[PDB]
Design a protein around this nucleic acid. Structure first.
Lengths: 78, 326, 326, 326, 287
RNA sequence: GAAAUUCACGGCGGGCUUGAUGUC
């Protein structure tokens, strides 16, 4: 549903943040680069939030993808 | 009369031990005492994407960015050592007696029947060629499963001891043996007649084996793996966990027992293609096939529903009894 | 009829070994016995800021402070020794036989088909020029990947042994060879005809290689690295982990196998620019490009969807079969 | 058309080696074979508090206690030897060819453009005075950075070998040279024309250097240091870790490469004050200044945003190309 | 305008070397070639020995770091003020006339038989700068007018202000007594008292010898300043930032006084008034 | 009370940590 770009070379798990927008919110469905089986996502405000907390998590480079994935994956948002 | 059991169990006689990957050099073959064991080092890989995609309804900008990137996960890679060319396999499997002596008895009369059948297929039918399946189609080292591909010289020294003292002693060459058929070999009959001295309650036999692939230098292996069920959240980086002994490289008993369960050429469909593992419902985990389906009457859950009241299997008994040697 | 497999697997024949960085001097070249191995020394750096700043909504005061500041860190970067000018590369890759002999069989009839295709591209099509890709575009030592830049003299002695006894013996000069094209060389045909004696089940061949860059003194290298996934919390100081053998400097097998997978000039777009690594979906990890995209019909996941029922590839077979030499 | 790369990389051609602090005596200068190397001793010091206080909101009783006390610490600090007056510097830097030959190609057409620019600033513009920056403003041994202060006689013998055999041979006196300007010297043009024979792909050149400060007796040095990030908890006593080679005293490559990167008098503001290190954004780590700020159009991240479409730099090209000699 | 630096550094010009404890006999004084080094004194050797070749560096305020280059130009202007305007006759006469009296040989100075100080100097291997002294014939609370002391201090005038490269190979000889002990330089027991726990005073060694390290030695030629706030002739303290002697745990020039080295350019860099306490505000920058 | 989870896949490219001090 209205697919957009990734977050910076994401697997190491055959997994990704896989950002793709909703009509009002934005879905960042942490999912497979294979079959399409996903784990839980998170819907929120725009790229001006997305990069802002995505930058805001610890880790160096690939660590931001990593702690990002464990952050989305223990989700609050249904 | 003599209805089937609501609860049956049979002990896995002729069970097996673990493997001891440790590395040595050929013509230093006989000096297996301090053969240095190998540990699953962790390498740290990057990748491309060789996987197919569902191609039904997808945005193309998915896959164009999918194939492009790095899926870079770290992989625990067991590696050989630097100058040691032999492998090493200390696998002391031991045979247990009393082939149909159950663990549970929902009806003791049914147990007495099945023991009568054990005297039928034990006193009436013999285990020369049964143990010649367990040797002549296991000394050819399907034992060393994935590492069998292009051995330099697969030396199989299936030794045996009373005690600390080792007396049962014989030498082989698994590369000098077939892996689709069994052939008449005298020393193979020494080992298989020795297992005849094992299974049917004559002498306690635990076969300390020394199997040596003399293959090559520092190459990888195909050693036994683990799982990622409820361990891929705290790790998420290793995705292939090799199971370890104490500072060593396992080949676990669970792959190893279908090296000495892959016998039965009494499969329904094939002829000489498939030396499958003789099991209940005869399923090989690779091909996802069911030799002896429900529709055939060749089920291990029907061989006593036929034999326990009707006595007719006629030499498919062997793959209906080695269903109960597990 | 003969639908595609839900489960396929093919064994990586012609696999490779690890690398042995150890340092020597030229004209002491032949005396490679006690060539002293190299260990990853650790540096520490003060990082400047070459990273291009974002220009969406940012400020020109932050770059002042940050470019003034130092985000320093340490890097485990390996150094040559003091007076040793040669490098050293003991890489004994070994070839496995039976190029399409699968590991899994979702349909055995499909396996019989693919083996028939293996007899087609093996008995019908030959592997003279295939092995001349694997030599004439790998003896030119793309092998020694990042260190190839301005070698003094890259000596490639691809040796081979029956046993401990070494008989397969030939000498080269990778600097005397092209790295965008392959040329006709007689001894290159000795080695590639030797790999013809390897791949198609004739003789077990594991090529103990001795590759020597005679480059310079105490300079750095480009040796194989690791990752910082769930190791950058307890460390946070090293940010480039070089993987080690036992007291040595690896160049791992994972970069090394695309030194002998970078063959195919059967790419869709380019002509002589790109000697890419022949893979499923043909993705090079550097350029993030997808030669043989989905939109082209040049997919390795479509070459048996075409060839297994339709028999038409016509000499792009070679980069559709070396997709299955992995 | 021809948009900028989302991923660029350029290999550090003309890279450098490590340093070899080892001590000798002048007029025993030529006999550098067994020149004994130096090991950074651990001085252990007690000190005052020269650090200024924060002066915002502080009770005055604290600092009386503070300056009254001793915050003593160990500090690993190297000492010269007893009777050896020369220093010693074996630094064999080697030049790599193909100055703009990239490592990554987000657009191969952009790569072809930049290679065209490399033929422009290489065939069109010459590297006589570029290499005369790299010699005439580096033979004056900014090389030996902190030890240059009051050398008795700084002898610079930038030697060079084909092989083990040394042929490139020339002698200097860095104290007989300026360190704010470059002057016309014939042998300096022999070395810089030799680097002209290096950089632009003519001959593989790794310059085994012998630089000798004949300074004084047992004095200290300014040798290369380390860090205290996640090592100051288990130690907390040493607070200045000198990095070591194998039983020796490093001056690491990271300070050393801005001895042969401090060239550019093409800085925006100054005239002859500042011989800064030509970098992306042109930041010197000492003064925390940003010559070529964002507000000026003199950015290395704007010189191809201007030159790749607009072709106008006009001899500030040199400090926009030696941005890509790293 | 011209705010203070967030990052300052100044190189320790006029630095020093290590010491060479090796033992000799008086009237065999001149034959210092094979004077046997010590690892207690030796049995029959009565002289000590001190080869300490300190060397002077030039360009007294030439910084290492420049948080503002204009501030650096200011401070260099001040260096021309206290260098061209103010002279270093009596500054170097502190560094000789209150260091030739061998506070150099610190703890061993107690009851020397005859402390001979031969502060030699060489161009090269060739030694030309040559002068002889007697530190016991000199005061250690005051400085007196001596002609050869002005030869050495005028020689350091030829050193510090960029005229000639001078590294003074010294030969200082205490002719004291026989096999007695010393007060040689020590070490520490931080994270070495667990594996040892038996030695509790580690003397630092040169190669088979007895150090007196540079860290005690540089406050033999930093103990100058009689420009201390409180005392008069009692205390020849070591001129430092905040002027703290490590013995007495005192802070001459406390924060409450305006005599701080971290306030002498906060005053002088904008206000130009120190008036001959400059000397102990500049030798704060000769370190 | 007894089950083979697999085969396999490039991670990299650069970097002035430095400036000076009393062992109780």
């Amino acid at each position: 549903m209205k697919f957009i770009k990734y977050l910076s070379t994401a697997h190491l798990n055959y997994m990704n943040i896989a950002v793709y927008e909703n009509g009002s919110k934005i879905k960042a469905r942490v999912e497979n680069v294979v079959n399409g089986k996903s784990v839980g996502a998170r819907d929120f405000d725009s790229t001006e939030q997305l990069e802002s907390w995505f930058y805001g998590l610890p880790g160096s480079g690939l660590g931001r993808i990593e702690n990002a994935m464990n952050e989305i994956s223990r989700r609050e948002n249904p | 009369e003599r209805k089937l059991d609501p609860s049956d169990a049979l002990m896995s006689a002729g069970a097996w031990a673990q493997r001891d990957a440790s590395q040595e050099w050929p013509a230093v073959t006989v000096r297996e005492k301090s053969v240095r064991g190998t540990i699953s080092n962790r390498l740290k890989t990057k990748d491309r994407d060789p996987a197919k995609l569902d191609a039904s309804i997808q945005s193309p900008n998915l896959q164009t960015v999918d194939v492009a990137n790095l899926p870079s996960d770290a992989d625990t890679l067991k590696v050989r050592f630097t100058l040691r060319v032999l492998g090493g396999a200390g696998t002391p499997s031991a045979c247990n007696d009393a082939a149909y002596r159950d663990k549970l008895l929902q009806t003791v009369a049914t147990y007495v029947n099945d023991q009568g059948f054990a005297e039928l297929a034990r006193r009436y039918a013999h285990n020369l060629a049964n143990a010649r399946f367990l040797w002549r189609n296991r000394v050819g080292a399907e034992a060393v499963e994935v590492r069998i591909n292009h051995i330099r010289q697969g030396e199989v020294a299936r030794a045996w001891r009373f005690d600390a003292l080792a007396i049962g002693l014989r030498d082989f060459k698994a590369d000098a043996e077939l892996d689709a058929l069994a052939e008449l070999i005298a020393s193979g009959l020494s080992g298989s007649g020795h297992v005849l001295l094992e299974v049917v309650a004559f002498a306690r036999i635990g076969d300390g084996q020394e199997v040596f692939p003399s293959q090559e230098l520092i190459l990888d292996k195909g050693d036994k793996k683990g799982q990622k069920s409820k361990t891929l959240y705290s790790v998420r980086d290793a995705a292939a966990i090799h199971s370890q002994k104490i500072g060593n490289a396992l080949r676990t008993i669970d792959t190893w027992y279908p090296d000495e369960d892959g016998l039965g050429p009494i499969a329904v469909e094939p002829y000489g293609s498939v030396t499958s593992q003789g099991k209940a419902y005869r399923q090989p985990k690779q091909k996802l096939d069911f030799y002896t389906l429900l529709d055939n009457w060749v089920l291990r859950d029907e061989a006593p529903a036929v034999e326990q009241q009707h006595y007719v299997i006629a030499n498919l008994i062997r793959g209906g009894v080695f269903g109960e040697a597990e």
